Amino acid sequence: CGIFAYLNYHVPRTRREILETLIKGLQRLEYRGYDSAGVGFDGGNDKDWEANACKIQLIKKKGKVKALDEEVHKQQDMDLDIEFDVHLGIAHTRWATHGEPSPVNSHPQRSDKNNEFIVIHNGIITNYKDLKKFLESKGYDFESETDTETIAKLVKYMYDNRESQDTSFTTLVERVIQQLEGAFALVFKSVHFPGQAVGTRRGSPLLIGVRSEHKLSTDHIPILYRSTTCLFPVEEKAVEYYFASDASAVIEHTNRVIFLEDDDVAAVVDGRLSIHRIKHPGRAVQTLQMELQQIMKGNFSSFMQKEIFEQPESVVNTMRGRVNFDDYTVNLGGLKDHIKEIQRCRRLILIACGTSYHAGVATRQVLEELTELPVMVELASDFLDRNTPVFRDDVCFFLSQSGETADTLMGLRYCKERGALTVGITNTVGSSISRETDCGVHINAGPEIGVASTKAYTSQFVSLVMFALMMCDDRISMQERRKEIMLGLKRLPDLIKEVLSMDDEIQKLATELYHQKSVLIMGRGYHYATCLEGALKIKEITYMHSEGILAGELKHGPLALVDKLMPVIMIIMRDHTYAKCQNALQQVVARQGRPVVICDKEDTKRTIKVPHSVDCLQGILSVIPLQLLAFHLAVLRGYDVDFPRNL
Amino acid sequence: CGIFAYLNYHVPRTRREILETLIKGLQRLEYRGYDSAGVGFDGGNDKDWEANACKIQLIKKKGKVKALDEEVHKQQDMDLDIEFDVHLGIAHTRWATHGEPSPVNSHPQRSDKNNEFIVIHNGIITNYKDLKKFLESKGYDFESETDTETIAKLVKYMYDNRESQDTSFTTLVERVIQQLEGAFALVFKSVHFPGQAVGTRRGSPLLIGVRSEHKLSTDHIPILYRTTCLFPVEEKAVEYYFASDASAVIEHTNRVIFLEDDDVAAVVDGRLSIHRRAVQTLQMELQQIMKGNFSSFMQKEIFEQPESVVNTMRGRVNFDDYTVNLGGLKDHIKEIQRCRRLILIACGTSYHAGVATRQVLEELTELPVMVELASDFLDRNTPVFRDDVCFFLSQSGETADTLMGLRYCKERGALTVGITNTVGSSISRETDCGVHINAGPEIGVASTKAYTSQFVSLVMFALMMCDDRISMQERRKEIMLGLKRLPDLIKEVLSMDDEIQKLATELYHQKSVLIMGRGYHYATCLEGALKIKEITYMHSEGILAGELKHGPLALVDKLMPVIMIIMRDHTYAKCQNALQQVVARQGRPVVICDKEDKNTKRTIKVPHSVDCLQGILSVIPLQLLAFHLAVLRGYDVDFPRNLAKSVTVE
Ligand SMILES: O=C[C@H](O)[C@@H](O)[C@H](O)[C@H](O)COP(=O)(O)O
Ligand SMILES: O=C[C@H](O)[C@@H](O)[C@H](O)[C@H](O)COP(=O)(O)O
């Protein structure tokens, strides 16, 4: 789950400082549920650090990182005051899967009883059964039940069979990954290559942060196959490197990062960073706009609560630099090039999973309205199962907060093979979907740390609307509609705040459903997505059977569930479907239903009155009371909203 | 909502023979609405039946028809022994979608406290509020909250301001429909016009049955405009049967006159005339609307799927040469292949039929296939083009949203195809072409054979669209042999009825059940979930298997009942992963799988078939499960609560 390594090269740090840095990185990567963490570093208490680089020491522990930190400072014969001019430390937090949680099964995994090679690993090796046999036949005995130990044992096998006494650490890892199958991100450390690090990935994210008070030789590292050919400080040697599986563990130290790509072998040798391959392409040193405050709870007791209540801000962040209300223009920079190509295409296909799919349903109508193109919205897993027909004049959008969901990513590659124009709507710089799409939009909602999608849904929503507004900016007959929608976006942050000020009314509703085992959420049109997304939130966070029902489908069967006992929530807004929803309401009440109504500004039982906005934006306001409802219900029932129950 | 009126002209019927005929005609229509019922006949206890036509009697009550039949009998005022040589009685069962199903809101409505004009209405008047404020000013008091009372209070307003002392009943009705907006199918009765019935329609079904041992004067009633009427030649004996459906008339005769929009039929002096036709024979046997030896229509229709599947393929599938021919589409297939997209539009189970066949349609046509819920399709003003081919799946052929979607697509120049189970329905008439699935009448409220016959019908279309591809010949043979073997496999599934019933005894007490599937069985878990909702009232929900890991799986614990559909097709490995996830969450799921397929100790093994046909076999256990659960919970499978069959209005 979480990888972190800290390499100080001619930046003196005490053993304490190094360990504090490693512990701190794991906390950035530590999400609720992890149950195994460890650190690897140079042992020995020789005042001169150059003699302690032949004893790798491991401290691994089951439980939360807090427990690891206590074990660190709780070491008998370990002096934390030794200063290292050069040192590499690696760290890992995990959610034990393959084996049972235990100190042995925690990372790093070692190559022998003297820790000649150690590795931290994110992912799974498919052929790990076969590899363990090949090494055992060569005498290597295993101590863990994890697939990671095979990696540590295999790199020593390559070392034990090297042709020359100076075969590079890179060459060894190159030979290792060539024998691995599956997905992995790896960081290696060895006594035979003191101060050096090797990081490589295949289908699992791995990035490198860099920091130095000196000028760096380049901002675009060229690839070396098997002058400024590598990255290094120019004035002096001092530099710091940060390997990590997520930017959250690097951003507090530096915002200059390199995102590795599949089969890259990045190595730090003599403090200089190079990137090797076997196959002028290069890897860019880029600046992240992320900042530490964005991954902290602040004054909120949970990340779910923070991300719900900060949606006024995240919606604004989504629009910053992209909307101009002075002259009613929208400019998504990532699409200003392909914008005219897109309009020459004949169909829009939105492909996503879960809540990201709900964002497509939530904006499908306005996309049809403003683009006038057919809009198909697909669940990624079903899209793949059916081998859906795709053509060269299709424009395919891929909605993904993480930018890594397997089905959404495989759908992307499916559509690229067939020649379709691909567009990524993501919330994670460097992610796979953001790279492999022809173009894309970063929704810029800030990191989503909570288990459930809250601000990501609303920012995706706003992003797709902004795209719809770009697609009709040349239509005279639509100028008024664009103006109306855009003045809605202008007012939206304050309308969200207005909804959040009704939190007390949502708590009251939560206590009325406290003991209920089901609830039906009914909507149609613009609020079909709203009732589907609310039902998912209440399933995922509250663990009760909430179900979204298309209002127009009631009389076709589902209405049989309505009686005096079945809780019902109906979304009834003042748009063109208003009279129809009034009909559905009369149908529910006719069958002894006592429903709660989320209705528009100044429209049977309790009513949650949200403010009135443009019809194609109401979904953003109407889903928030459902977000809060799931939150408050879970809190009432003693659940930790930040502790996932999916796994 | 059902309509039924009995007009016996010069055929002596006692007051019990007519009342037992009105109720008998409502039971034939009860599945269209069973929230209330009523009847309208002549009162008075005078031997000379001529001195009784001036006294109307209304008997309306809340509940099914069996609640009305008991209200009609055991009365202390109605003498059921008066011989009527000429009499007219109107009846009606109501689907109270709004308000209470009270007797005051049921039909026949009335125009005053003396009942001068009573009307039975099927449909909605889109301007009854405007008609209610006009009549309230002229001196008319309203009692019910329905829109039908504005039709009764209005036919009397045209009678209170006529021009001649003897204006025909047609004239009065013709003036009413001119002030009525929306759809309606009416059958009037007045004391001023004894024995005369008027039957007009507009966007709603309405036919007139005729029985007479004497020769009928003609077989093509000429539509008139404000040697003309249908009647027996020599004698006067004739019995008419107004009704909004053919099942309530077939029992008495198979000679009906299907009216058209704005045709103002009228029976005067026992002569049927149309104002502003073709007397034809019905092609339906009474056995087709009889439960037989089954205790419910739903059970019969499930166990008869081996037959209805055969009927859907009869005369259309030849297994010796592997050819498929649907007459309704023999010519259009040429132009359909030149089109660029298929759109399937339907509601409920009919929508599931499209989900169930979407993949194979994409496979064999190579065209994009979009499946749309009719109500949402209309809400979004979905883009449609001239080179779209739009299919409309409707068992009844009258579902409002599906029908409006049709007219939407026709307005945009699309090619429209109807997949119905009702000849003469609106959807079958107004589409460019179509197919009659020919599954027989479906009486149970929950669709069973209609689903599997639609499924089979869409596959047959797919087989036609690829009959000229060399590369797909083997695939076509694989599918068609699957169809050949399908009836017997359905019998093999049905033989597990008892095993399904035992499972039901383990679930009837639960509040919720999750049904999971993917690929070809996404539709299966959606349709099964809908059925369990509809007749059992359990909170059953279908969950796409591939979406479990994205949130819903958090709802699974050792207590949540789970049904999974794991079949030996290309999603088997994926479905095995979903099964592992469910168990990891402590779920103890029931698995529907193939015979040749573990932790699962609660399995339902269906026979293995072609992947794109397996949905037919996998859904049947869920049909049976829903049936058995509803029995265990003391519910009626034929008359589920809060709804009826065929949604023909808003
Ligand atoms: O609360 C819902 C979850 O956030 C989940 O449904 C999520 O939306 C999907 O797993 C797709 O995630 P991505 O947006 O990263 O693809
Ligand atoms: O059990 C389900 C019901 O039968 C219902 O969902 C029905 O399928 C729809 O009302 C479609 O009706 P039509 O097929 O007659 O259009």
PDB file of C-alpha atoms in Angstrom, chain A residues 125-306:
ATOM      1  CA  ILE A 125       3.720 -11.113  -8.165  1.00  0.00           C
ATOM      2  CA  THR A 126       1.679 -13.610 -10.174  1.00  0.00           C
ATOM      3  CA  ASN A 127       4.464 -16.182 -10.687  1.00  0.00           C
ATOM      4  CA  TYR A 128       5.537 -15.958  -7.030  1.00  0.00           C
ATOM      5  CA  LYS A 129       4.854 -19.679  -6.546  1.00  0.00           C
ATOM      6  CA  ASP A 130       7.227 -20.689  -9.348  1.00  0.00           C
ATOM      7  CA  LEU A 131       9.987 -18.290  -8.273  1.00  0.00           C
ATOM      8  CA  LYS A 132       9.964 -19.592  -4.696  1.00  0.00           C
ATOM      9  CA  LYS A 133      10.603 -23.088  -6.072  1.00  0.00           C
ATOM     10  CA  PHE A 134      13.450 -22.054  -8.379  1.00  0.00           C
ATOM     11  CA  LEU A 135      15.267 -20.330  -5.513  1.00  0.00           C
ATOM     12  CA  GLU A 136      14.629 -23.136  -3.021  1.00  0.00           C
ATOM     13  CA  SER A 137      16.174 -25.563  -5.513  1.00  0.00           C
ATOM     14  CA  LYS A 138      19.257 -23.319  -5.308  1.00  0.00           C
ATOM     15  CA  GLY A 139      19.394 -23.520  -1.497  1.00  0.00           C
ATOM     16  CA  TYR A 140      17.523 -20.338  -0.547  1.00  0.00           C
ATOM     17  CA  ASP A 141      15.194 -20.916   2.411  1.00  0.00           C
ATOM     18  CA  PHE A 142      12.142 -18.717   2.963  1.00  0.00           C
ATOM     19  CA  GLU A 143      10.852 -17.329   6.258  1.00  0.00           C
ATOM     20  CA  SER A 144       7.751 -15.338   5.228  1.00  0.00           C
ATOM     21  CA  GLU A 145       4.455 -16.207   3.562  1.00  0.00           C
ATOM     22  CA  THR A 146       4.561 -13.092   1.354  1.00  0.00           C
ATOM     23  CA  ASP A 147       5.358 -12.915  -2.344  1.00  0.00           C
ATOM     24  CA  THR A 148       7.780 -10.069  -1.583  1.00  0.00           C
ATOM     25  CA  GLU A 149      10.486 -12.303  -0.103  1.00  0.00           C
ATOM     26  CA  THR A 150      10.958 -13.953  -3.504  1.00  0.00           C
ATOM     27  CA  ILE A 151      12.006 -10.528  -4.809  1.00  0.00           C
ATOM     28  CA  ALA A 152      14.609 -10.113  -2.066  1.00  0.00           C
ATOM     29  CA  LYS A 153      15.857 -13.676  -2.563  1.00  0.00           C
ATOM     30  CA  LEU A 154      15.932 -13.397  -6.359  1.00  0.00           C
ATOM     31  CA  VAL A 155      18.055 -10.239  -6.449  1.00  0.00           C
ATOM     32  CA  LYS A 156      20.642 -12.013  -4.286  1.00  0.00           C
ATOM     33  CA  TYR A 157      20.559 -14.957  -6.703  1.00  0.00           C
ATOM     34  CA  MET A 158      21.415 -12.576  -9.544  1.00  0.00           C
ATOM     35  CA  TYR A 159      24.156 -11.071  -7.370  1.00  0.00           C
ATOM     36  CA  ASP A 160      25.448 -14.547  -6.484  1.00  0.00           C
ATOM     37  CA  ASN A 161      25.735 -15.336 -10.224  1.00  0.00           C
ATOM     38  CA  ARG A 162      27.049 -12.047 -11.609  1.00  0.00           C
ATOM     39  CA  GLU A 163      29.654 -12.237 -14.368  1.00  0.00           C
ATOM     40  CA  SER A 164      31.863  -9.376 -13.130  1.00  0.00           C
ATOM     41  CA  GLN A 165      32.657  -8.049  -9.669  1.00  0.00           C
ATOM     42  CA  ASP A 166      31.232  -4.624 -10.612  1.00  0.00           C
ATOM     43  CA  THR A 167      27.879  -5.442 -12.231  1.00  0.00           C
ATOM     44  CA  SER A 168      25.696  -2.440 -11.467  1.00  0.00           C
ATOM     45  CA  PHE A 169      22.834  -2.530  -8.989  1.00  0.00           C
ATOM     46  CA  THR A 170      20.599  -1.528 -11.916  1.00  0.00           C
ATOM     47  CA  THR A 171      21.683  -4.531 -13.993  1.00  0.00           C
ATOM     48  CA  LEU A 172      20.747  -6.793 -11.079  1.00  0.00           C
ATOM     49  CA  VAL A 173      17.239  -5.343 -10.689  1.00  0.00           C
ATOM     50  CA  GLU A 174      16.800  -5.417 -14.471  1.00  0.00           C
ATOM     51  CA  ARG A 175      17.416  -9.170 -14.316  1.00  0.00           C
ATOM     52  CA  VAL A 176      14.978  -9.498 -11.399  1.00  0.00           C
ATOM     53  CA  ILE A 177      11.972  -7.744 -12.940  1.00  0.00           C
ATOM     54  CA  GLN A 178      12.555  -9.647 -16.186  1.00  0.00           C
ATOM     55  CA  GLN A 179      11.644 -12.746 -14.146  1.00  0.00           C
ATOM     56  CA  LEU A 180       8.672 -11.164 -12.344  1.00  0.00           C
ATOM     57  CA  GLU A 181       5.071 -11.293 -13.531  1.00  0.00           C
ATOM     58  CA  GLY A 182       2.232  -9.108 -12.320  1.00  0.00           C
ATOM     59  CA  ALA A 183       2.139  -5.635 -10.794  1.00  0.00           C
ATOM     60  CA  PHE A 184       4.755  -4.054  -8.572  1.00  0.00           C
ATOM     61  CA  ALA A 185       6.478  -0.922  -7.361  1.00  0.00           C
ATOM     62  CA  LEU A 186       9.838  -1.613  -5.737  1.00  0.00           C
ATOM     63  CA  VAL A 187      12.642   0.126  -3.871  1.00  0.00           C
ATOM     64  CA  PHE A 188      15.871  -1.795  -3.239  1.00  0.00           C
ATOM     65  CA  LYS A 189      18.712  -1.373  -0.753  1.00  0.00           C
ATOM     66  CA  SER A 190      21.875  -3.436  -0.356  1.00  0.00           C
ATOM     67  CA  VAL A 191      25.043  -3.576   1.722  1.00  0.00           C
ATOM     68  CA  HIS A 192      26.920  -4.249  -1.530  1.00  0.00           C
ATOM     69  CA  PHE A 193      25.806  -0.860  -2.926  1.00  0.00           C
ATOM     70  CA  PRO A 194      25.934   1.490   0.071  1.00  0.00           C
ATOM     71  CA  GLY A 195      24.010   4.732  -0.279  1.00  0.00           C
ATOM     72  CA  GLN A 196      22.466   3.630  -3.581  1.00  0.00           C
ATOM     73  CA  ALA A 197      18.786   3.136  -4.326  1.00  0.00           C
ATOM     74  CA  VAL A 198      17.041   1.400  -7.214  1.00  0.00           C
ATOM     75  CA  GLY A 199      13.337   1.944  -7.853  1.00  0.00           C
ATOM     76  CA  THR A 200      11.233   0.318 -10.554  1.00  0.00           C
ATOM     77  CA  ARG A 201       7.547  -0.181 -11.269  1.00  0.00           C
ATOM     78  CA  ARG A 202       5.137  -2.045 -13.519  1.00  0.00           C
ATOM     79  CA  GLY A 203       1.456  -1.226 -13.125  1.00  0.00           C
ATOM     80  CA  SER A 204       1.929   0.424  -9.730  1.00  0.00           C
ATOM     81  CA  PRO A 205       2.743   4.106  -9.093  1.00  0.00           C
ATOM     82  CA  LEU A 206       6.200   5.152  -7.939  1.00  0.00           C
ATOM     83  CA  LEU A 207       7.607   8.683  -7.903  1.00  0.00           C
ATOM     84  CA  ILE A 208      10.812  10.384  -6.790  1.00  0.00           C
ATOM     85  CA  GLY A 209      11.005  13.732  -5.038  1.00  0.00           C
ATOM     86  CA  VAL A 210      14.208  15.774  -5.144  1.00  0.00           C
ATOM     87  CA  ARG A 211      15.510  18.654  -3.031  1.00  0.00           C
ATOM     88  CA  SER A 212      18.767  20.600  -3.041  1.00  0.00           C
ATOM     89  CA  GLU A 213      19.863  24.132  -2.237  1.00  0.00           C
ATOM     90  CA  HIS A 214      21.975  23.874  -5.403  1.00  0.00           C
ATOM     91  CA  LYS A 215      20.996  24.071  -9.050  1.00  0.00           C
ATOM     92  CA  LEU A 216      19.963  20.790 -10.644  1.00  0.00           C
ATOM     93  CA  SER A 217      21.570  19.649 -13.875  1.00  0.00           C
ATOM     94  CA  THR A 218      18.251  19.241 -15.707  1.00  0.00           C
ATOM     95  CA  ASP A 219      14.468  19.169 -15.451  1.00  0.00           C
ATOM     96  CA  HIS A 220      14.071  16.359 -18.023  1.00  0.00           C
ATOM     97  CA  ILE A 221      15.966  13.150 -17.224  1.00  0.00           C
ATOM     98  CA  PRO A 222      16.843  11.326 -20.474  1.00  0.00           C
ATOM     99  CA  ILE A 223      16.410   7.572 -20.683  1.00  0.00           C
ATOM    100  CA  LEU A 224      19.520   5.383 -20.865  1.00  0.00           C
ATOM    101  CA  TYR A 225      19.333   2.136 -22.838  1.00  0.00           C
ATOM    102  CA  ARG A 226      21.433  -1.026 -22.737  1.00  0.00           C
ATOM    103  CA  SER A 227      26.033  15.982 -21.589  1.00  0.00           C
ATOM    104  CA  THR A 228      23.604  16.144 -18.647  1.00  0.00           C
ATOM    105  CA  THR A 229      22.648  12.481 -18.952  1.00  0.00           C
ATOM    106  CA  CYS A 230      21.434  12.273 -15.332  1.00  0.00           C
ATOM    107  CA  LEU A 231      20.050  14.476 -12.556  1.00  0.00           C
ATOM    108  CA  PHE A 232      22.367  15.862  -9.875  1.00  0.00           C
ATOM    109  CA  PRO A 233      23.281  19.117  -8.098  1.00  0.00           C
ATOM    110  CA  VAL A 234      25.802  21.251  -9.957  1.00  0.00           C
ATOM    111  CA  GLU A 235      27.596  23.354  -7.323  1.00  0.00           C
ATOM    112  CA  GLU A 236      28.091  20.654  -4.672  1.00  0.00           C
ATOM    113  CA  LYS A 237      27.064  17.063  -3.889  1.00  0.00           C
ATOM    114  CA  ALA A 238      24.323  17.827  -1.356  1.00  0.00           C
ATOM    115  CA  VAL A 239      20.915  16.511  -2.405  1.00  0.00           C
ATOM    116  CA  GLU A 240      17.954  14.626  -0.924  1.00  0.00           C
ATOM    117  CA  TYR A 241      15.792  12.039  -2.673  1.00  0.00           C
ATOM    118  CA  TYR A 242      12.339  10.773  -1.718  1.00  0.00           C
ATOM    119  CA  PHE A 243      10.921   7.607  -3.253  1.00  0.00           C
ATOM    120  CA  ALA A 244       7.212   7.206  -2.616  1.00  0.00           C
ATOM    121  CA  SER A 245       4.092   5.494  -3.927  1.00  0.00           C
ATOM    122  CA  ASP A 246       2.021   8.648  -3.322  1.00  0.00           C
ATOM    123  CA  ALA A 247       2.838  12.350  -3.433  1.00  0.00           C
ATOM    124  CA  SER A 248       1.277  12.802   0.025  1.00  0.00           C
ATOM    125  CA  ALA A 249       4.554  11.613   1.611  1.00  0.00           C
ATOM    126  CA  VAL A 250       6.785  13.930  -0.441  1.00  0.00           C
ATOM    127  CA  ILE A 251       4.930  17.241  -0.705  1.00  0.00           C
ATOM    128  CA  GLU A 252       6.011  18.503   2.725  1.00  0.00           C
ATOM    129  CA  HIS A 253       9.707  18.148   1.800  1.00  0.00           C
ATOM    130  CA  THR A 254       9.580  19.121  -1.884  1.00  0.00           C
ATOM    131  CA  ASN A 255       7.200  19.749  -4.771  1.00  0.00           C
ATOM    132  CA  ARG A 256       9.680  18.654  -7.481  1.00  0.00           C
ATOM    133  CA  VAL A 257       8.894  15.043  -8.402  1.00  0.00           C
ATOM    134  CA  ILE A 258       9.521  12.535 -11.190  1.00  0.00           C
ATOM    135  CA  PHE A 259       6.779  10.025 -12.040  1.00  0.00           C
ATOM    136  CA  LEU A 260       8.319   6.747 -13.169  1.00  0.00           C
ATOM    137  CA  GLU A 261       6.718   4.683 -15.932  1.00  0.00           C
ATOM    138  CA  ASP A 262       6.370   0.949 -16.463  1.00  0.00           C
ATOM    139  CA  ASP A 263       9.735  -0.845 -16.549  1.00  0.00           C
ATOM    140  CA  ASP A 264      11.750   2.263 -15.727  1.00  0.00           C
ATOM    141  CA  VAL A 265      14.730   1.419 -13.523  1.00  0.00           C
ATOM    142  CA  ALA A 266      15.651   4.578 -11.609  1.00  0.00           C
ATOM    143  CA  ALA A 267      18.936   4.431  -9.702  1.00  0.00           C
ATOM    144  CA  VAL A 268      20.794   6.796  -7.381  1.00  0.00           C
ATOM    145  CA  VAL A 269      24.546   6.177  -7.646  1.00  0.00           C
ATOM    146  CA  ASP A 270      26.967   8.636  -6.018  1.00  0.00           C
ATOM    147  CA  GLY A 271      24.008  10.929  -5.383  1.00  0.00           C
ATOM    148  CA  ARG A 272      23.183  11.114  -9.114  1.00  0.00           C
ATOM    149  CA  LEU A 273      19.790   9.950 -10.396  1.00  0.00           C
ATOM    150  CA  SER A 274      19.500   8.170 -13.748  1.00  0.00           C
ATOM    151  CA  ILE A 275      16.692   6.234 -15.423  1.00  0.00           C
ATOM    152  CA  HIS A 276      17.426   3.098 -17.442  1.00  0.00           C
ATOM    153  CA  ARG A 277      15.471   0.919 -19.860  1.00  0.00           C
ATOM    154  CA  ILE A 278      16.114  -2.102 -22.075  1.00  0.00           C
ATOM    155  CA  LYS A 279      14.098  -1.057 -25.142  1.00  0.00           C
ATOM    156  CA  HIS A 280      14.706  11.406 -27.228  1.00  0.00           C
ATOM    157  CA  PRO A 281      12.263  10.122 -24.587  1.00  0.00           C
ATOM    158  CA  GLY A 282      12.791  11.233 -21.013  1.00  0.00           C
ATOM    159  CA  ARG A 283      11.174  11.811 -17.636  1.00  0.00           C
ATOM    160  CA  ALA A 284      10.309  15.354 -16.581  1.00  0.00           C
ATOM    161  CA  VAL A 285      10.968  16.938 -13.210  1.00  0.00           C
ATOM    162  CA  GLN A 286       7.647  18.672 -12.583  1.00  0.00           C
ATOM    163  CA  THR A 287       6.186  20.884  -9.875  1.00  0.00           C
ATOM    164  CA  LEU A 288       3.194  19.680  -7.867  1.00  0.00           C
ATOM    165  CA  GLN A 289       0.652  22.246  -6.709  1.00  0.00           C
ATOM    166  CA  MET A 290      -0.265  19.972  -3.788  1.00  0.00           C
ATOM    167  CA  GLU A 291       0.480  21.111  -0.244  1.00  0.00           C
ATOM    168  CA  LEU A 292       0.578  19.357   3.121  1.00  0.00           C
ATOM    169  CA  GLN A 293      -2.489  21.147   4.476  1.00  0.00           C
ATOM    170  CA  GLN A 294      -4.645  19.444   1.840  1.00  0.00           C
ATOM    171  CA  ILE A 295      -4.116  15.960   3.337  1.00  0.00           C
ATOM    172  CA  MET A 296      -4.788  16.966   6.965  1.00  0.00           C
ATOM    173  CA  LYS A 297      -8.103  16.829   8.804  1.00  0.00           C
ATOM    174  CA  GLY A 298      -7.668  20.313  10.241  1.00  0.00           C
ATOM    175  CA  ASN A 299     -10.382  20.986  12.805  1.00  0.00           C
ATOM    176  CA  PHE A 300     -12.630  18.205  11.471  1.00  0.00           C
ATOM    177  CA  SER A 301     -12.901  14.913  13.328  1.00  0.00           C
ATOM    178  CA  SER A 302     -12.897  12.892  10.081  1.00  0.00           C
ATOM    179  CA  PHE A 303     -11.782  13.223   6.477  1.00  0.00           C
ATOM    180  CA  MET A 304     -15.320  12.480   5.293  1.00  0.00           C
ATOM    181  CA  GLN A 305     -16.587  15.496   7.222  1.00  0.00           C
ATOM    182  CA  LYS A 306     -13.795  17.781   5.989  1.00  0.00           C
TER     183      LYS A 306
END
